[PDB]
Design a protein around this ligand. Sequence first.
Ligand SMILES: Nc1ncccc1OCc1cccc2ccccc12
Length: 351
Amino acid sequence: ERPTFYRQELNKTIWEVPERYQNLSPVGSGAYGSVCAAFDTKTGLRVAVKKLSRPFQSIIHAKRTYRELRLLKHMKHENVIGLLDVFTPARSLEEFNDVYLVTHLMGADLNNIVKCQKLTDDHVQFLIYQILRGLKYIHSADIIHRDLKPSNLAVNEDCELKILDFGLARHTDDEMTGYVATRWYRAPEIMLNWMHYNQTVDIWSVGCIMAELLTGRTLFPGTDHIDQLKLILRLVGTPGAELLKKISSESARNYIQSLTQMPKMNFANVFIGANPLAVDLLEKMLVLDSDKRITAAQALAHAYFAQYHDPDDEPVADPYDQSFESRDLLIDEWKSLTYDEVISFVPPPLD
Ligand SMILES: Nc1ncccc1OCc1cccc2ccccc12
Protein backbone atom coordinates (compact mmCIF):
# COMPACT_ATOMS: atom_id res chain seq x y z
CA GLU A 1 0.00 0.00 0.00
CA ARG A 2 1.04 3.61 -0.73
CA PRO A 3 2.09 5.51 2.40
CA THR A 4 0.90 9.01 3.29
CA PHE A 5 3.29 11.84 2.40
CA TYR A 6 3.76 15.19 4.07
CA ARG A 7 5.15 18.36 2.50
CA GLN A 8 7.73 20.85 3.84
CA GLU A 9 10.05 23.55 2.47
CA LEU A 10 13.69 22.60 3.03
CA ASN A 11 16.14 25.12 1.60
CA LYS A 12 14.32 26.62 -1.38
CA THR A 13 12.70 23.26 -2.37
CA ILE A 14 9.47 21.57 -1.25
CA TRP A 15 10.22 18.06 0.04
CA GLU A 16 7.32 15.57 -0.11
CA VAL A 17 8.25 12.34 1.74
CA PRO A 18 6.49 9.45 3.53
CA GLU A 19 5.58 10.03 7.23
CA ARG A 20 8.01 7.31 8.37
CA TYR A 21 10.79 9.84 7.72
CA GLN A 22 10.96 12.50 10.40
CA ASN A 23 13.27 15.31 11.50
CA LEU A 24 14.64 16.30 8.09
CA SER A 25 17.38 18.91 8.06
CA PRO A 26 19.82 19.80 5.23
CA VAL A 27 23.11 17.89 5.37
CA GLY A 28 26.56 18.02 3.82
CA SER A 29 26.55 21.64 2.63
CA GLY A 30 24.86 21.43 -0.76
CA ALA A 31 27.92 19.25 -1.55
CA TYR A 32 26.04 15.94 -2.13
CA GLY A 33 23.05 17.61 -3.82
CA SER A 34 19.74 18.22 -2.09
CA VAL A 35 20.41 15.82 0.78
CA CYS A 36 18.59 15.70 4.13
CA ALA A 37 19.40 13.70 7.20
CA ALA A 38 16.29 12.14 8.71
CA PHE A 39 15.02 9.63 11.20
CA ASP A 40 13.30 6.51 9.74
CA THR A 41 10.80 5.42 12.36
CA LYS A 42 9.99 2.17 10.56
CA THR A 43 13.61 0.90 10.73
CA GLY A 44 15.07 3.02 13.57
CA LEU A 45 17.90 4.02 11.22
CA ARG A 46 19.34 7.47 10.67
CA VAL A 47 19.32 7.98 6.95
CA ALA A 48 20.26 10.46 4.26
CA VAL A 49 17.47 11.26 1.80
CA LYS A 50 18.49 12.71 -1.56
CA LYS A 51 15.94 14.47 -3.73
CA LEU A 52 17.21 14.53 -7.32
CA SER A 53 17.16 18.03 -8.84
CA ARG A 54 15.22 18.33 -12.08
CA PRO A 55 15.75 14.67 -12.99
CA PHE A 56 14.06 14.70 -16.43
CA GLN A 57 14.94 18.20 -17.80
CA SER A 58 17.01 16.74 -20.69
CA ILE A 59 17.91 13.40 -22.31
CA ILE A 60 21.28 13.60 -20.59
CA HIS A 61 19.59 14.20 -17.21
CA ALA A 62 16.87 11.57 -17.73
CA LYS A 63 19.49 8.95 -18.64
CA ARG A 64 21.64 9.98 -15.67
CA THR A 65 18.67 9.67 -13.29
CA TYR A 66 18.02 6.21 -14.77
CA ARG A 67 21.74 5.32 -14.42
CA GLU A 68 21.99 6.29 -10.77
CA LEU A 69 18.84 4.49 -9.73
CA ARG A 70 19.83 1.38 -11.67
CA LEU A 71 23.27 1.33 -10.06
CA LEU A 72 22.06 1.94 -6.50
CA LYS A 73 19.37 -0.80 -6.88
CA HIS A 74 22.08 -3.30 -7.85
CA MET A 75 24.57 -2.66 -5.08
CA LYS A 76 24.20 -5.15 -2.22
CA HIS A 77 27.54 -5.28 -0.41
CA GLU A 78 28.82 -4.42 3.10
CA ASN A 79 31.43 -2.02 1.72
CA VAL A 80 29.17 -0.22 -0.77
CA ILE A 81 26.25 2.17 -0.45
CA GLY A 82 22.99 0.23 -0.38
CA LEU A 83 19.61 1.64 -1.35
CA LEU A 84 17.30 1.65 1.68
CA ASP A 85 14.39 3.16 -0.18
CA VAL A 86 13.37 5.03 -3.33
CA PHE A 87 10.06 6.88 -3.69
CA THR A 88 7.96 9.49 -5.47
CA PRO A 89 4.83 11.39 -4.29
CA ALA A 90 3.34 10.53 -7.69
CA ARG A 91 0.49 8.03 -8.04
CA SER A 92 1.05 7.71 -11.82
CA LEU A 93 3.63 8.05 -14.61
CA GLU A 94 1.83 11.21 -15.86
CA GLU A 95 2.43 13.03 -12.56
CA PHE A 96 5.90 11.45 -12.04
CA ASN A 97 8.58 14.15 -11.78
CA ASP A 98 10.67 13.76 -8.62
CA VAL A 99 12.83 10.94 -7.35
CA TYR A 100 14.05 10.52 -3.79
CA LEU A 101 16.71 8.07 -2.68
CA VAL A 102 17.44 6.87 0.84
CA THR A 103 20.60 5.36 2.31
CA HIS A 104 22.37 5.11 5.71
CA LEU A 105 23.50 8.45 7.20
CA MET A 106 27.26 8.66 6.68
CA GLY A 107 28.36 11.07 9.44
CA ALA A 108 32.14 10.82 8.71
CA ASP A 109 34.16 10.31 5.48
CA LEU A 110 37.81 9.24 5.09
CA ASN A 111 39.15 12.84 4.93
CA ASN A 112 37.74 13.29 8.43
CA ILE A 113 39.54 10.23 9.74
CA VAL A 114 42.88 11.01 7.93
CA LYS A 115 42.85 14.73 8.83
CA CYS A 116 41.54 14.43 12.43
CA GLN A 117 42.74 11.05 13.72
CA LYS A 118 46.04 9.11 13.65
CA LEU A 119 46.20 5.75 11.86
CA THR A 120 48.14 2.66 12.86
CA ASP A 121 49.35 0.33 10.16
CA ASP A 122 46.53 -2.01 11.17
CA HIS A 123 43.93 0.72 10.57
CA VAL A 124 45.36 1.21 7.08
CA GLN A 125 45.22 -2.54 6.48
CA PHE A 126 41.60 -2.65 7.50
CA LEU A 127 40.56 0.52 5.65
CA ILE A 128 42.25 -0.44 2.38
CA TYR A 129 41.12 -4.11 2.72
CA GLN A 130 37.52 -2.89 2.77
CA ILE A 131 37.89 -0.52 -0.18
CA LEU A 132 39.39 -3.38 -2.21
CA ARG A 133 36.69 -5.84 -1.12
CA GLY A 134 33.91 -3.51 -2.27
CA LEU A 135 35.94 -2.83 -5.43
CA LYS A 136 36.20 -6.55 -6.16
CA TYR A 137 32.38 -6.66 -6.00
CA ILE A 138 31.85 -3.53 -8.13
CA HIS A 139 34.42 -4.55 -10.79
CA SER A 140 32.92 -8.07 -10.96
CA ALA A 141 29.69 -6.41 -12.28
CA ASP A 142 31.88 -4.55 -14.81
CA ILE A 143 31.14 -1.33 -12.96
CA ILE A 144 33.86 1.35 -12.77
CA HIS A 145 33.72 3.91 -9.97
CA ARG A 146 35.94 6.42 -11.85
CA ASP A 147 35.97 8.84 -8.83
CA LEU A 148 37.42 7.16 -5.73
CA LYS A 149 38.71 9.66 -3.27
CA PRO A 150 38.52 9.93 0.55
CA SER A 151 35.36 12.11 0.40
CA ASN A 152 33.14 9.44 -1.16
CA LEU A 153 34.31 6.84 1.37
CA ALA A 154 32.19 6.66 4.52
CA VAL A 155 33.76 5.44 7.74
CA ASN A 156 31.97 4.82 11.03
CA GLU A 157 33.42 4.81 14.58
CA ASP A 158 34.34 1.12 14.31
CA CYS A 159 36.46 2.07 11.25
CA GLU A 160 33.92 0.19 9.01
CA LEU A 161 33.84 1.53 5.47
CA LYS A 162 31.48 2.02 2.51
CA ILE A 163 32.14 3.16 -1.07
CA LEU A 164 29.57 5.82 -1.90
CA ASP A 165 28.88 8.33 -4.56
CA PHE A 166 29.80 6.66 -7.80
CA GLY A 167 30.28 10.33 -8.84
CA LEU A 168 27.56 9.80 -11.44
CA ALA A 169 27.13 13.41 -12.67
CA ARG A 170 30.55 13.60 -14.38
CA HIS A 171 32.78 16.60 -13.51
CA THR A 172 33.08 19.99 -15.25
CA ASP A 173 36.39 20.92 -16.90
CA ASP A 174 36.49 23.72 -14.26
CA GLU A 175 35.90 21.43 -11.24
CA MET A 176 38.99 19.54 -12.45
CA THR A 177 41.17 22.65 -12.85
CA GLY A 178 44.04 23.67 -10.52
CA TYR A 179 44.87 22.63 -6.96
CA VAL A 180 41.86 20.40 -6.31
CA ALA A 181 41.17 17.09 -4.61
CA THR A 182 38.80 16.34 -7.50
CA ARG A 183 41.88 15.41 -9.66
CA TRP A 184 44.59 14.23 -7.17
CA TYR A 185 43.37 10.60 -7.06
CA ARG A 186 42.75 10.13 -10.81
CA ALA A 187 44.72 7.67 -12.89
CA PRO A 188 46.98 9.44 -15.40
CA GLU A 189 45.28 7.79 -18.37
CA ILE A 190 41.93 9.47 -17.54
CA MET A 191 43.32 12.79 -16.24
CA LEU A 192 45.11 13.27 -19.56
CA ASN A 193 42.84 11.08 -21.74
CA TRP A 194 45.56 8.75 -23.03
CA MET A 195 43.38 5.82 -24.06
CA HIS A 196 40.02 4.17 -23.55
CA TYR A 197 40.12 3.56 -19.77
CA ASN A 198 38.83 0.65 -17.68
CA GLN A 199 38.40 -0.57 -14.09
CA THR A 200 42.15 -0.50 -13.38
CA VAL A 201 41.78 3.29 -12.91
CA ASP A 202 40.16 2.68 -9.46
CA ILE A 203 43.22 0.71 -8.34
CA TRP A 204 45.35 3.78 -9.00
CA SER A 205 42.95 5.80 -6.85
CA VAL A 206 43.39 3.14 -4.09
CA GLY A 207 47.20 3.57 -4.21
CA CYS A 208 46.90 7.37 -3.84
CA ILE A 209 44.48 6.84 -0.89
CA MET A 210 46.63 4.22 0.78
CA ALA A 211 49.80 6.38 0.52
CA GLU A 212 47.90 9.27 2.21
CA LEU A 213 46.75 7.06 5.12
CA LEU A 214 50.33 5.93 5.56
CA THR A 215 51.81 9.46 5.38
CA GLY A 216 48.96 11.82 6.29
CA ARG A 217 49.69 13.72 3.04
CA THR A 218 48.30 13.84 -0.47
CA LEU A 219 50.39 11.64 -2.76
CA PHE A 220 50.13 13.86 -5.89
CA PRO A 221 48.73 17.32 -4.89
CA GLY A 222 49.37 18.81 -8.33
CA THR A 223 48.72 22.55 -8.81
CA ASP A 224 47.29 21.46 -12.19
CA HIS A 225 47.12 18.61 -14.64
CA ILE A 226 50.67 19.04 -15.86
CA ASP A 227 52.25 19.72 -12.52
CA GLN A 228 50.39 16.55 -11.32
CA LEU A 229 51.76 14.40 -14.20
CA LYS A 230 55.21 15.60 -13.20
CA LEU A 231 54.64 14.50 -9.57
CA ILE A 232 53.44 11.12 -10.82
CA LEU A 233 56.32 10.47 -13.22
CA ARG A 234 58.87 11.58 -10.67
CA LEU A 235 57.74 8.76 -8.31
CA VAL A 236 56.85 6.16 -10.89
CA GLY A 237 59.29 6.82 -13.77
CA THR A 238 58.62 8.09 -17.29
CA PRO A 239 56.91 5.60 -19.65
CA GLY A 240 58.79 3.10 -21.79
CA ALA A 241 58.12 2.38 -25.46
CA GLU A 242 55.68 -0.33 -24.48
CA LEU A 243 53.35 2.04 -22.59
CA LEU A 244 53.82 4.76 -25.26
CA LYS A 245 52.52 2.43 -28.03
CA LYS A 246 49.33 1.95 -25.91
CA ILE A 247 48.62 5.73 -25.71
CA SER A 248 46.12 6.31 -28.55
CA SER A 249 46.19 10.06 -28.11
CA GLU A 250 48.96 11.02 -30.56
CA SER A 251 49.06 14.49 -28.99
CA ALA A 252 49.32 13.21 -25.42
CA ARG A 253 52.03 10.71 -26.49
CA ASN A 254 54.02 13.45 -28.17
CA TYR A 255 53.83 15.55 -24.99
CA ILE A 256 55.11 12.74 -22.68
CA GLN A 257 58.08 12.18 -25.01
CA SER A 258 59.02 15.85 -24.49
CA LEU A 259 59.85 15.03 -20.86
CA THR A 260 63.33 14.01 -19.68
CA GLN A 261 63.48 10.28 -18.88
CA MET A 262 63.20 9.47 -15.18
CA PRO A 263 63.55 6.16 -13.37
CA LYS A 264 61.00 4.85 -10.86
CA MET A 265 62.05 5.87 -7.32
CA ASN A 266 62.65 3.59 -4.37
CA PHE A 267 59.30 3.52 -2.47
CA ALA A 268 61.12 2.33 0.69
CA ASN A 269 62.84 5.73 0.60
CA VAL A 270 59.61 7.58 -0.24
CA PHE A 271 57.49 5.82 2.42
CA ILE A 272 60.07 5.74 5.23
CA GLY A 273 59.10 3.53 8.16
CA ALA A 274 56.16 2.00 6.31
CA ASN A 275 55.52 -1.73 6.60
CA PRO A 276 57.53 -3.35 3.75
CA LEU A 277 54.40 -5.22 2.76
CA ALA A 278 52.53 -1.87 2.42
CA VAL A 279 55.31 -0.57 0.20
CA ASP A 280 55.31 -3.68 -2.00
CA LEU A 281 51.53 -3.44 -2.54
CA LEU A 282 51.91 0.27 -3.36
CA GLU A 283 54.53 -0.55 -6.01
CA LYS A 284 51.99 -2.91 -7.67
CA MET A 285 49.09 -0.48 -7.49
CA LEU A 286 50.98 2.62 -8.65
CA VAL A 287 52.05 1.23 -12.00
CA LEU A 288 51.91 3.60 -14.92
CA ASP A 289 50.84 0.88 -17.38
CA SER A 290 47.36 -0.06 -16.25
CA ASP A 291 47.48 -3.49 -17.88
CA LYS A 292 50.22 -4.28 -15.33
CA ARG A 293 48.33 -3.09 -12.20
CA ILE A 294 47.30 -5.43 -9.43
CA THR A 295 43.57 -5.99 -9.57
CA ALA A 296 41.29 -5.77 -6.53
CA ALA A 297 40.89 -9.53 -6.48
CA GLN A 298 44.65 -10.13 -6.73
CA ALA A 299 45.26 -7.40 -4.10
CA LEU A 300 42.93 -9.01 -1.50
CA ALA A 301 45.26 -12.05 -1.55
CA HIS A 302 48.34 -9.84 -0.94
CA ALA A 303 50.25 -10.64 2.25
CA TYR A 304 49.65 -7.11 3.68
CA PHE A 305 46.01 -8.11 4.46
CA ALA A 306 46.58 -11.63 5.89
CA GLN A 307 44.95 -10.43 9.15
CA TYR A 308 41.68 -9.72 7.24
CA HIS A 309 41.67 -11.83 4.03
CA ASP A 310 38.98 -14.47 3.86
CA PRO A 311 38.38 -15.83 0.32
CA ASP A 312 35.01 -17.29 1.38
CA ASP A 313 33.85 -13.83 2.45
CA GLU A 314 34.85 -11.61 -0.52
CA PRO A 315 31.77 -11.82 -2.69
CA VAL A 316 31.08 -10.94 -6.27
CA ALA A 317 28.13 -9.07 -7.73
CA ASP A 318 25.16 -10.56 -9.59
CA PRO A 319 25.41 -9.71 -13.28
CA TYR A 320 24.70 -6.09 -14.18
CA ASP A 321 23.07 -5.35 -17.51
CA GLN A 322 24.15 -1.89 -18.59
CA SER A 323 23.27 -2.30 -22.27
CA PHE A 324 21.11 0.81 -21.72
CA GLU A 325 24.38 2.85 -21.73
CA SER A 326 24.72 2.60 -25.52
CA ARG A 327 20.98 3.31 -26.09
CA ASP A 328 19.41 6.40 -27.62
CA LEU A 329 15.99 7.10 -26.07
CA LEU A 330 13.88 10.19 -25.65
CA ILE A 331 13.28 11.91 -22.28
CA ASP A 332 9.86 10.26 -21.65
CA GLU A 333 11.31 6.86 -22.49
CA TRP A 334 14.08 7.22 -19.92
CA LYS A 335 11.54 8.69 -17.50
CA SER A 336 9.17 5.68 -17.82
CA LEU A 337 12.13 3.31 -17.54
CA THR A 338 13.02 5.13 -14.27
CA TYR A 339 9.38 5.06 -13.04
CA ASP A 340 9.26 1.24 -13.42
CA GLU A 341 12.51 0.91 -11.43
CA VAL A 342 10.95 3.09 -8.68
CA ILE A 343 7.76 0.96 -8.67
CA SER A 344 9.62 -2.40 -8.61
CA PHE A 345 11.92 -1.40 -5.70
CA VAL A 346 11.92 -3.96 -2.88
CA PRO A 347 13.37 -2.91 0.48
CA PRO A 348 16.37 -4.67 2.00
CA PRO A 349 15.49 -7.58 4.34
CA LEU A 350 14.79 -6.57 7.94
CA ASP A 351 17.22 -7.81 10.61
N1 LIG B 1 24.78 8.50 3.10
C1 LIG B 1 25.05 9.83 3.36
N2 LIG B 1 25.06 10.27 4.61
C2 LIG B 1 25.33 11.54 4.90
C3 LIG B 1 25.62 12.45 3.90
C4 LIG B 1 25.64 12.03 2.57
C5 LIG B 1 25.34 10.69 2.29
O1 LIG B 1 25.35 10.20 1.01
C6 LIG B 1 24.82 11.15 0.06
C7 LIG B 1 24.35 10.33 -1.13
C8 LIG B 1 25.15 10.16 -2.23
C9 LIG B 1 24.72 9.36 -3.31
C10 LIG B 1 23.50 8.72 -3.31
C11 LIG B 1 22.65 8.87 -2.20
C12 LIG B 1 21.40 8.24 -2.14
C13 LIG B 1 20.64 8.43 -1.03
C14 LIG B 1 21.04 9.21 0.05
C15 LIG B 1 22.24 9.83 0.04
C16 LIG B 1 23.08 9.69 -1.08
